[PDB]
Amino acid sequence: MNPFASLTLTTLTILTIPIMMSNSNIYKTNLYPNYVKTTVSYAFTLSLVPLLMFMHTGQEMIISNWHWMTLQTVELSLSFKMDYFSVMFIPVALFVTWSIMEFSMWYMHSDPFINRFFKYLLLFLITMMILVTANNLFQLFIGWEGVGIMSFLLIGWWHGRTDANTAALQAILYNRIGDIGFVLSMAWFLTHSNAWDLQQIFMLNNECPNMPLIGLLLAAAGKSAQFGLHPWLPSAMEGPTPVSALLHSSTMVVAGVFLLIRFYPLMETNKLVQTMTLCLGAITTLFTALCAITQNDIKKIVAFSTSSQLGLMMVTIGINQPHLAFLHI
Amino acid sequence: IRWTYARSANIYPNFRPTPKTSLLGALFGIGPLFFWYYVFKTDRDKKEKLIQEGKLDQTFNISY
Amino acid sequence: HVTKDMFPGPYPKTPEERAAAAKKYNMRVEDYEPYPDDGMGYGDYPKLPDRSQQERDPWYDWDHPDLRLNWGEPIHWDLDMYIRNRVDTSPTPVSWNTMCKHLF
Amino acid sequence: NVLQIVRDHWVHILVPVGFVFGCYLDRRSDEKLTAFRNKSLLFKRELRPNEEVTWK
Amino acid sequence: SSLLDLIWLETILPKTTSFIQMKMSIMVSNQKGLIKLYFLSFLITIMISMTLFN
Amino acid sequence: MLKIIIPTTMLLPMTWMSKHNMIWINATVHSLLISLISLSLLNQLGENSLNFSLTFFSDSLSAPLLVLTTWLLPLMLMASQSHLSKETTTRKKLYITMLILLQLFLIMTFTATELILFYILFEATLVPTLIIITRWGNQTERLNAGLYFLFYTLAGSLPLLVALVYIQNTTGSLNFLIIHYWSHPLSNSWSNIFMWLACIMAFMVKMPLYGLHLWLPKAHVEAPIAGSMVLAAVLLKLGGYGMMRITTILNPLTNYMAYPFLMLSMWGMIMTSSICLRQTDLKSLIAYSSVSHMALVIVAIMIQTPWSFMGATALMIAHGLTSSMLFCLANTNYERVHSRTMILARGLQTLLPLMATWWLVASLTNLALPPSINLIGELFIITASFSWSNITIILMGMNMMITALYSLYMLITTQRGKYTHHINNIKPSFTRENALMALHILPLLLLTLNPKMILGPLY
Amino acid sequence: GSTFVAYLPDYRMQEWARREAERLVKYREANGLPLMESNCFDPNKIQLPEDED
Amino acid sequence: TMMSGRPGRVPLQFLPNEARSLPPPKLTDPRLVYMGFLGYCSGLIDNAIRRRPVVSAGLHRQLLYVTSFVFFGYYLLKRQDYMYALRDHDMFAYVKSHPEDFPEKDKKTYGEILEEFHPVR
Amino acid sequence: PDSWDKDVYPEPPRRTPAPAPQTSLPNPVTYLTKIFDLLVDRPVTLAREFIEQQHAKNRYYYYHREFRRVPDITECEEKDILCMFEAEMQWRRDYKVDQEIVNIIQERLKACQQREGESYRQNCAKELEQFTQVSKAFQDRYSDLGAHYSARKCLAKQKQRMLAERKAAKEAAAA
Ligand SMILES: CCCCCCCCCCCCCCCCCC(=O)OC[C@H](COP(=O)([O-])OCC(O)COP(=O)([O-])OC[C@@H](COC(=O)CCCCCCCCCCCCCCCCC)OC(=O)CCCCCCCCCCCCCCCCC)OC(=O)CCCCCCCCCCCCCCCCC
Ligand SMILES: CCCCCCCCCCCCCCCCC[C@@H](O)O[C@H](CO[C@H](O)CCCCCCCCCCCCCCC)COP(=O)(O)OCC[N+](C)(C)C
Ligand SMILES: CCCCCCCCCCCCCCCCC[C@@H](O)O[C@H](CO[C@H](O)CCCCCCCCCCCCCCC)COP(=O)(O)OCC[N+](C)(C)C
Ligand SMILES: CCCCCCCCCCCCCCCCC[C@@H](O)O[C@H](CO[C@H](O)CCCCCCCCCCCCCCC)COP(=O)(O)OCC[N+](C)(C)C
Numbered sequence A: 001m002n003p004f005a006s007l008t009l010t011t012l013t014i015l016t017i018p019i020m021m022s023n024s025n026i027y028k029t030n031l032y033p034n035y036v037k038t039t040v041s042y043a044f045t046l047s048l049v050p051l052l053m054f055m056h057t058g059q060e061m062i063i064s065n066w067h068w069m070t071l072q073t074v075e076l077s078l079s080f081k082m083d084y085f086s087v088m089f090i091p092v093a094l095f096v097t098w099s100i101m102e103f104s105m106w107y108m109h110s111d112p113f114i115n116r117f118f119k120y121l122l123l124f125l126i127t128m129m130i131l132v133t134a135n136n137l138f139q140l141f142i143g144w145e146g147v148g149i150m151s152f153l154l155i156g157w158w159h160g161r162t163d164a165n166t167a168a169l170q171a172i173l174y175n176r177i178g179d180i181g182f183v184l185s186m187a188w189f190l191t192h193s194n195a196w197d198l199q200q201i202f203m204l205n206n207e208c209p210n211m212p213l214i215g216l217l218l219a220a221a222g223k224s225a226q227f228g229l230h231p232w233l234p235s236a237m238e239g240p241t242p243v244s245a246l247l248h249s250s251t252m253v254v255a256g257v258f259l260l261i262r263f264y265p266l267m268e269t270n271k272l273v274q275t276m277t278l279c280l281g282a283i284t285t286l287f288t289a290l291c292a293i294t295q296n297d298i299k300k301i302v303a304f305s306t307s308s309q310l311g312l313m314m315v316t317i318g319i320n321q322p323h324l325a326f327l328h329i
Numbered sequence B: 001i002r003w004t005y006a007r008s009a010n011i012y013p014n015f016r017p018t019p020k021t022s023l024l025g026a027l028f029g030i031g032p033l034f035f036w037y038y039v040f041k042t043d044r045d046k047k048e049k050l051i052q053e054g055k056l057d058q059t060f061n062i063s064y
Numbered sequence C: 001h002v003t004k005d006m007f008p009g010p011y012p013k014t015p016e017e018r019a020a021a022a023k024k025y026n027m028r029v030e031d032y033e034p035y036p037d038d039g040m041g042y043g044d045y046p047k048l049p050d051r052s053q054q055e056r057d058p059w060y061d062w063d064h065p066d067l068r069l070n071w072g073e074p075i076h077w078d079l080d081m082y083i084r085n086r087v088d089t090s091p092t093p094v095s096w097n098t099m100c101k102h103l104f
Numbered sequence D: 001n002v003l004q005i006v007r008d009h010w011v012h013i014l015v016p017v018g019f020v021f022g023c024y025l026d027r028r029s030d031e032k033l034t035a036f037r038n039k040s041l042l043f044k045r046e047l048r049p050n051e052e053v054t055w056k
Numbered sequence E: 001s002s003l004l005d006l007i008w009l010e011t012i013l014p015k016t017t018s019f020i021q022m023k024m025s026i027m028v029s030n031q032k033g034l035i036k037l038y039f040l041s042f043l044i045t046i047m048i049s050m051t052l053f054n
Numbered sequence F: 001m002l003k004i005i006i007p008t009t010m011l012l013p014m015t016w017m018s019k020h021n022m023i024w025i026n027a028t029v030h031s032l033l034i035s036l037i038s039l040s041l042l043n044q045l046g047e048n049s050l051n052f053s054l055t056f057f058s059d060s061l062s063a064p065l066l067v068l069t070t071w072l073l074p075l076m077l078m079a080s081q082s083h084l085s086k087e088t089t090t091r092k093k094l095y096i097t098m099l100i101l102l103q104l105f106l107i108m109t110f111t112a113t114e115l116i117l118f119y120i121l122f123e124a125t126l127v128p129t130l131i132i133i134t135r136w137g138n139q140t141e142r143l144n145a146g147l148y149f150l151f152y153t154l155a156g157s158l159p160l161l162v163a164l165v166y167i168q169n170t171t172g173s174l175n176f177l178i179i180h181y182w183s184h185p186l187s188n189s190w191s192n193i194f195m196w197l198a199c200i201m202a203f204m205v206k207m208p209l210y211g212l213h214l215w216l217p218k219a220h221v222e223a224p225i226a227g228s229m230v231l232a233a234v235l236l237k238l239g240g241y242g243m244m245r246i247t248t249i250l251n252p253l254t255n256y257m258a259y260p261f262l263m264l265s266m267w268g269m270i271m272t273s274s275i276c277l278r279q280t281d282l283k284s285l286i287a288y289s290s291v292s293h294m295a296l297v298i299v300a301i302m303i304q305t306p307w308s309f310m311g312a313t314a315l316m317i318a319h320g321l322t323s324s325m326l327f328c329l330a331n332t333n334y335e336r337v338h339s340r341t342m343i344l345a346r347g348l349q350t351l352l353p354l355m356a357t358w359w360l361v362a363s364l365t366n367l368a369l370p371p372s373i374n375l376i377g378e379l380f381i382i383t384a385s386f387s388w389s390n391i392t393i394i395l396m397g398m399n400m401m402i403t404a405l406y407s408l409y410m411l412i413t414t415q416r417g418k419y420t421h422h423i424n425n426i427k428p429s430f431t432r433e434n435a436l437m438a439l440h441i442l443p444l445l446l447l448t449l450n451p452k453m454i455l456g457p458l459y
Numbered sequence G: 001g002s003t004f005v006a007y008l009p010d011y012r013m014q015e016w017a018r019r020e021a022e023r024l025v026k027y028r029e030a031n032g033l034p035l036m037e038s039n040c041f042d043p044n045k046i047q048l049p050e051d052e053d
Numbered sequence H: 001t002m003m004s005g006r007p008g009r010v011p012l013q014f015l016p017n018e019a020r021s022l023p024p025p026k027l028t029d030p031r032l033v034y035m036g037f038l039g040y041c042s043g044l045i046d047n048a049i050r051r052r053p054v055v056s057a058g059l060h061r062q063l064l065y066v067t068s069f070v071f072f073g074y075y076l077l078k079r080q081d082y083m084y085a086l087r088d089h090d091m092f093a094y095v096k097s098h099p100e101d102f103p104e105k106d107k108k109t110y111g112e113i114l115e116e117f118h119p120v121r
Numbered sequence I: 001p002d003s004w005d006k007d008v009y010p011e012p013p014r015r016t017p018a019p020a021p022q023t024s025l026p027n028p029v030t031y032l033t034k035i036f037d038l039l040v041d042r043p044v045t046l047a048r049e050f051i052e053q054q055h056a057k058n059r060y061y062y063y064h065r066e067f068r069r070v071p072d073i074t075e076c077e078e079k080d081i082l083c084m085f086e087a088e089m090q091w092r093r094d095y096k097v098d099q100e101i102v103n104i105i106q107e108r109l110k111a112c113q114q115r116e117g118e119s120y121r122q123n124c125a126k127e128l129e130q131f132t133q134v135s136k137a138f139q140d141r142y143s144d145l146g147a148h149y150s151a152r153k154c155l156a157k158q159k160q161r162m163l164a165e166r167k168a169a170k171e172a173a174a175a
Helices: A003-014 A017-023 A032-057 A084-107 A114-133 A137-155 A162-193 A198-204 A210-224 A232-238 A241-251 A255-262 A271-292 A298-318 A322-328 B002-008 B019-053 C015-024 C096-103 D006-030 E004-029 E035-052 F002-016 F023-041 F062-083 F089-111 F115-124 F126-135 F142-171 F176-181 F190-206 F215-222 F225-235 F237-249 F254-277 F282-303 F306-337 F353-366 F373-388 F392-415 F431-447 G002-006 G014-031 H030-049 H059-097 I028-056 I081-123 I125-142 I151-174
Strands: A062-071 A074-081
Touching: A003 A032, A003 A062, A003 A074, A003 A084, A003 A114, A003 I028, A017 A032, A017 A114, A032 A084, A032 A114, A032 I028, A074 A137, A074 I081, A084 A114, A084 A241, A084 A255, A084 A322, A114 A137, A114 A241, A114 A255, A137 A162, A137 A210, A137 A232, A137 A241, A137 A255, A162 A198, A162 A210, A162 A232, A162 F373, A162 F392, A198 I081, A210 A255, A210 A271, A210 A298, A232 A241, A232 A298, A241 A298, A255 A298, A255 A322, A271 A298, A298 A322, B019 E004, B019 F254, D006 F002, D006 F023, E004 F142, F002 F023, F002 F089, F023 F062, F023 F089, F023 G002, F062 F089, F062 F225, F062 F237, F062 F306, F062 F431, F089 F115, F089 F126, F089 F225, F089 F237, F115 F126, F115 F142, F115 F237, F126 F142, F126 F225, F142 F190, F142 F215, F176 F237, F176 I081, F190 F237, F190 F254, F215 F225, F215 F282, F225 F237, F225 F282, F225 F306, F237 F282, F237 F306, F254 F282, F254 F392, F282 F306, F282 F373, F282 F392, F306 F353, F306 F373, F306 F431, F353 F392, F353 F431, F373 F392, F373 F431, G014 I081, H030 H059, I081 I125, I081 I151, I125 I151
Parallel strands: none
Antiparallel strands: A062 A074
């Protein structure tokens, strides 16, 4: 069949081989971090191919490969959406992770558990790739919760430090506050649209009501650290600097914004939720920049800069410009 | 040992039915139940009246 | 190894049993003060200052350095609420009312 | 050594013998509920040239 | 934890039952062994049975 | 169905004629074999049921519970091997006899085509558990716990019996099949209201309902490890199974009568989740978490929709496995420290790393991390509740947040931080304990691959 | 046991149900029938009670 | 059902002659097996109380317990079956002789019976 | 492929544009897909040929089970349990077949939405109306029976709807 389909699934699959070999002999040696870095680089150069195919013709696919349980008229399956957002974000995230791992082999050299650090970095990358390419709400929730657990484990990397554990539990708390809205959105979409699949949700909602979009907005605010739920992102600087650079800077924290990007056909039909998104983004970017301009910890300054950029992304979503928000990501 | 015992097993022998204790117990243990009952009963009465009137628009509502 | 007389008892009414209770908790009779005798099951247990464990001296050599506690000292009733992982009561550079007003 | 470990390992055989006895008892109890065999409206079938009962 | 679970939910079902049964047992079993009182009670219940069930 | 019942009965002569040093090996081997045999009841039908005989029948609600019940006995034997080592041979054999009798009663309870037979076995389970708690418990409160655990149950179960016989005098049968096929609406009357209450309260007290949940922390804190395992894994699910079975004759009165129980459950799940936040005892914390999960199951059964029933089945199985694992981990800590207080032994990740991994996985599955079957049941119940009323989402979301909070609090308090200095008797974890944790956790992650096996008869 | 459960035969009749639905849809699409019907039972075999009020 | 005064009942007769018209219980009847099991348990408890090796102290005594329990159980099962047969015989005869009290109800199908529908919402 | 019916799962003719290169500069997509063919498609096809010929050496069949029609719950006496059992089982089988029909129509809808790209709102109206009709019918049949549903409850719901419809029609005729 078409090559484009095979390449997209191979990238994600070969991202998981070092996790399988985590019980092998190579995990007991000092060559494991280099093995993980090489795997990520190969995945990046392999994922460059579907990007070229899309840039040439614009190839788009849905791959529903495995049928998981069926619930009367509701069918749940392992389905991947390989649209422009996925095929554009995957190479960028892989490139950033490759650079971060190469930096970590120098930064975390004296750490006794450096293989576990790389294993952890790879697990976060896998969960984020699950989040980005999900075609239904259950799979997207799987990625949503996986990135949260990985951030909890990586913030509290030094578990003998009280403040690290406090920060990890803080991140979990705020993300559960957002998860309330995520679960509300899932319940509404199943009860009214009879699906968690994206195609049926788009088809059956020509004029989306307030409640599902407000749940989506609450989830996005929780996971992108908007004004009501902001402090966990600066508090997350307790983890090692590579963790701050990969998760809480450029890949995981944009997830909430990405969610609002993923549902943009429904968002454009509602003026109230658009206005709420715009106002939340504006207050977030202002408040976090205002906090930033007076800080003395350098990592805190960069974290507040990240939060302001996320607020700007929310403003762009609120003015009904999702592709520009993706480009900013 | 004293801390855990005081927190767990010494409470009831030192309990005394007092106006403060009685009012706080009644409030915190009954008021939320009746508040939530009123809220849910009102919500479901409105939904039932709407569905009898036919103006609910339950299209595509297959799973319950 | 703890005897029957080493457990919390009822609210002390007389100075003699007040002194006995203060002795039980390894603290001075003057410093001892029970919770007010209401229907709540506090009984005979010291009402220690409501300070958090974050306010304890971090340079003192505690027997439990992370919790900042010594072995035999009496334990605050709400210790698990003040454990440096949770709510703390440490003084701030700005007053609580001023911060509330400005944030609001 | 035979006739010595038997006196010591005889207990192990009981669980499997109980299972076989239970299977036989299940079949025996099944044999008394054949009032409608080949008589339901759904599976009323003509017997094969060398078939006596549709199920056992 | 303390007000509802350790005190009032305990007071309502189990503690009240224990108290009621304890008092009823102490009342019923406490007879000084004086057959005078026993047979006086017998006369009272005999007359009540005669005046109540017919 | 006798192919499972007879080997369980043969477990007793095999136990009592075993050598003094061969009881655990033989019991474990043959219990595992019985579990393997019982695993072939999972082949269910989309039609009625597996009606073996006039006395026993199988269902896709019954089969997962039966498989879990069989699988629990070997784990209970492994967990009990340690603290019963200094015990006489006769008393060890008596303990194993109690465990086997409890399994036999549970297996016959879950099939039990008759409601009176179900009631008789449902109450027969009460005796071995009571003996186990009051005989092989460590503290002086065990007796008191047993008393509570007894009378609460009977307080609900004697009215049910009366109602049961009453029903047979009017219907003429108590067979589940005839009861289901010949069901007639229940009028809105005082007599019918009290019949409804008599039918419900027996199963409601055993879940337990939030108001009637006081016996559970006592019984769990006081019982030995195997007693806690069977109480949290199987005995709490008898109420859910009974309610799902019996609510077929209670319509349409359930619509009105369910409101007080729905409010009690939806508020008490918040209450018990918050109670877990301030708890100085591991076993007590795990017991309160169990109360919260069973409150959610009660909401599911009272709503009485297909998604509610599927979620209730999934959540019952998942909670059984997870709570048994949590009790086993706490018991491994207790057998070293002898304290059972959470704040005492700290920083155990540095001293026991693999057991810290087991703790992490158990906390993640108690937290309902997708795609675990815990979250499958949670989400199905939440969706059904949202359809019932859109305002339930507030209480469900609060419960999820508080659940994550106390699960990670329990993990961080015991595993993270600095080790307690004066505790120097912490030995490396045994192969028996690691294997016990693995045998708890691998079945959960395997069940998430085939969820329809635990989604019940409405799948 | 996991392998045995994985390969349990389709006694819940999911494949059978999908094949029945496929052939039923094929027939109804071709014959112009309105796919699924609103009445689950044939109205001609139901005797309703006259109200005459 | 008080059959104490039932006509033609010989006063102290355990099994009447007409009970011979009924099929006897099989020797492998599950109830007979349970009575034998009860006798076996009695033998085990007898050994235990007298402080003897419980399983292998007196084989003659245990055999006698099992045999006596089986004997009495056989006769008890016969009497039980006979009494239930009498109950059914009397009930059927009474229904036959009182046709006006047990009428033949009209056959109605569900397609012509109106049952109230109560939606679950 | 023959593995499924083209009528139950219809597809458009799938018109594909032809490459019209405006420049002589070599593109990477064609060369890269050529090496992909050479390195992946060819060995996979060889392995499939081997597996298929091994399968063809051993050919055996399975059958789709046929269920005849039984009297339904409307033809069953009030307490006759045998016909009630037969009717209940038949009704349950029909219920599952209806679920699968709804699933087929939903699959059609999802495939149309993905296939039509930015024009899905206009070019998938037929599938939307099909799903609207089938969803309306399924909701009429089974929406509010709840757990412990039965053929008797479905019949009672249908009868209630029929009384409402007859009353409305008599009112309209006499209005
Ligand atoms: C659901 C129905 C199905 C199941 C049926 C269950 C009932 C059946 C049996 C009923 C009673 C009969 C036996 C009881 C006599 C007691 C004798 C005794 O003490 O045991 C010692 C004796 C061996 O010890 P020993 O050296 O001879 O002398 C030690 C002294 O006896 C004394 O030893 P010690 O002085 O060194 O130790 C003192 C100990 C001694 O105290 C005891 O041993 C207690 C005895 C049990 C009480 C019996 C009560 C009457 C029946 C009640 C049944 C209740 C069921 C309803 C559910 C409620 C659950 C409680 O007392 C204590 O430690 C006090 C603390 C105990 C904790 C609280 C008490 C709870 C007891 C509840 C037990 C209930 C089940 C008992 C099962 C049988 C146990 C042997 O054990 C045995 O060997 C007898 C077991 C039966 C032998 C089976 C042989 C057949 C195998 C080959 C044939 C294969 C069959 C298939 C054929 C086809 C294959 C090819
Ligand atoms: C303690 C821990 C938890 C334990 C379990 C608690 C759950 C049990 C709660 C019982 C459920 C409700 C009981 C009856 C519900 C019916 C509705 C009725 O009560 O309300 C009105 C009834 O009006 C009044 O309520 C009459 C009853 C008043 C007397 C009851 C005492 C009120 C407080 C006592 C609570 C104590 C509960 C525990 C007892 C040990 C309705 O008005 P009406 O249209 O006329 O009646 C319709 C019903 N009909 C047709 C059958 C007649
Ligand atoms: C250390 C790191 C690991 C190293 C090793 C690397 C390799 C890892 C790969 C394994 C995990 C990745 C997941 C991939 C899943 C592949 C297997 C899956 O596809 O099979 C599932 C099958 O799994 C089983 O269905 C679920 C497991 C059964 C659970 C039973 C528990 C065992 C009994 C013990 C008692 C427990 C009591 C619990 C109470 C209920 C689903 O199959 P299905 O699509 O459907 O159809 C099967 C084929 N058909 C079509 C012919 C029928
Ligand atoms: C409690 C457990 C059972 C213990 C019973 C004692 C066991 C030893 C007894 C040995 C056998 C006794 C039978 C006597 C021989 C002949 C008796 C016969 O002549 O009398 C008949 C009477 O037969 C006996 O009544 C039947 C005895 C059978 C008792 C066993 C039933 C127990 C209920 C089931 C529980 C399980 C127990 C089984 C294990 C032992 C006719 O009596 P009749 O003059 O016309 O009416 C007077 C009595 N009325 C007024 C009540 C009607």
